[PDB]
């Protein structure tokens, strides 16, 4: 997979997984607590992470969507501070617990650039929400269908849970992606569950990373 770090010479790490084809640039406007670094994981062609975690004391984890599935692998054995989902469950193409099947194969069947931009709407809601998204940079619709084609192919083959656990959820009220009911179904015996007014995209909502596990 792709990383983005930020070196703010930091005893911590935040860790955020993004989801499938999303920009970066999704989390640029959260602040950071002091004395955190930053690293933005994507681009899930593959659950390769080249990054040395063993200099930081926490390691605080926020998964988005898609990356909560990701995370779980990528982490396992890993001691996490905490670790924060974000509209994403541990059964990602699941009628009861995820995506439903007919939508995440669905997606994968009929995906060109105007289907990509229709999806990006169901993950905004709302059509000025839409639009905002739409000015961060876009990442090339080879890259994110080659993405889907691997996550599609890994999710099928590894219905794996609690490869590590989870701290709290955030479930927004208005996910047409990853439905609330489905949501709450995954995560109620989990872990802390918080509901918030929004969509699948949510970040949006906050102001500081910190927020989003304190």
Same mark, same amino acid.
Request: hydrophobic residues 45%; charged residues 20%.
């Given at each position: 997979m792709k990383t983005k770090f930020y070196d703010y010479q930091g005893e911590h790490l935040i860790l955020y997984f993004a989801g499938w084809g999303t920009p970066p640039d999704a989390v640029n406007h959260l /602040? +950071?607590?002091?004395?955190?670094?930053? +690293?933005?994981?994507?681009?899930? &062609?593959? +659950?390769?992470?080249? #990054?040395? @975690?063993?200099?930081?004391?926490? %390691?605080? @984890?926020?998964?988005?969507?898609m990356?909560?599935?990701?995370?779980?692998?990528? @982490?396992?054995? %890993?001691?996490? *501070?905490?670790?924060?989902?974000?509209?994403?469950?541990?059964?990602?193409c699941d009628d009861s617990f995820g995506i439903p099947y007919a939508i995440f194969k669905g997606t994968l069947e009929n995906l060109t650039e105007n289907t !990509?931009? *229709?999806?990006?709407? !169901? %993950?905004?809601?709302?059509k000025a929400? #839409?639009? !905002?998204?739409?000015?961060?940079?876009?990442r090339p619709f080879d890259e994110i269908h080659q993405e889907?084609?691997? @996550?599609?192919?890994? %999710? &099928?083959?590894? *219905? !794996?849970?609690?490869? /590590?656990?989870?701290?709290?959820?955030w479930v927004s009220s208005r996910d047409? /992606?990853?439905?609330?009911?489905?949501?709450? &179904?995954?995560?109620? +015996?989990?872990?802390?569950?918080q509901e918030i007014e929004g969509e699948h995209y949510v970040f949006s909502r906050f102001t500081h990373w910190s927020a989003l596990w304190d």
């Open positions: /602040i +950071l607590p002091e004395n955190h670094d930053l +690293l933005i994981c994507y681009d899930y &062609q593959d +659950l390769n992470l080249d #990054f040395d @975690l063993s200099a930081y004391r926490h %390691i605080r @984890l926020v998964a988005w969507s990356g909560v599935w990701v995370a779980e692998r990528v @982490l396992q054995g %890993i001691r996490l *501070k905490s670790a924060t989902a974000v509209n994403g469950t541990g059964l990602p !990509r931009l *229709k999806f990006e709407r !169901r %993950i905004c809601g709302d929400s #839409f639009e !905002r998204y739409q000015l961060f940079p876009a889907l084609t691997a @996550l599609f192919a890994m %999710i &099928q083959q590894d *219905k !794996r849970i609690d490869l /590590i656990h989870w701290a709290n959820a047409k /992606i990853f439905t609330p009911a489905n949501q709450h &179904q995954y995560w109620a +015996l989990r872990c802390a569950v």
